[PDB]
Amino acid sequence: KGTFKDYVRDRADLNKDKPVIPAAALAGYTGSGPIQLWQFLLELLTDKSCQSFISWTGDGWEFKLSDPDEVARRWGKRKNKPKMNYEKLSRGLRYYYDKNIIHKTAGKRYVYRFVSDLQSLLGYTPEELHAMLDVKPDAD
Predict the structure, then answer these.
(1) Nearest to 12 by CA among 60, 47, 59
(2) CA 102 – CA 62 distance, rounded (Å)
(3) Is 111 strand, coil or helix?
(4) Which helix (H) or strand (E) holds 96?
């Protein structure tokens, strides 16, 4: 892949340059404007320290927010909505639901699954990707 995979591999210093897939880093790479949720979530996920309140479950594209209202705030804060609650997040998640990027997998503790398969946009293979993030799927 010659996508954001090796893009970060040579760089990792785009915009939100913290994690494997930094939020504004992919936002600037693809040009989603003022960040895009799944790319912001990717930051927190592809970052091992930030992976805390949003960890992958291990294999395949699936992740889980540990303080999902907080994680909402995270997303909102970057869009001038610091009081972002899960619903406001879920509204955004619904925008990505339509693009088939995010399916809010209910029943689980705020687990969303990347129904777009980011292997095509990122190049990072799901297994390898989370594996480098030292993913801790147990929330708190």
Answers:
(1) 47
(2) 9
(3) strand
(4) helix 86-98
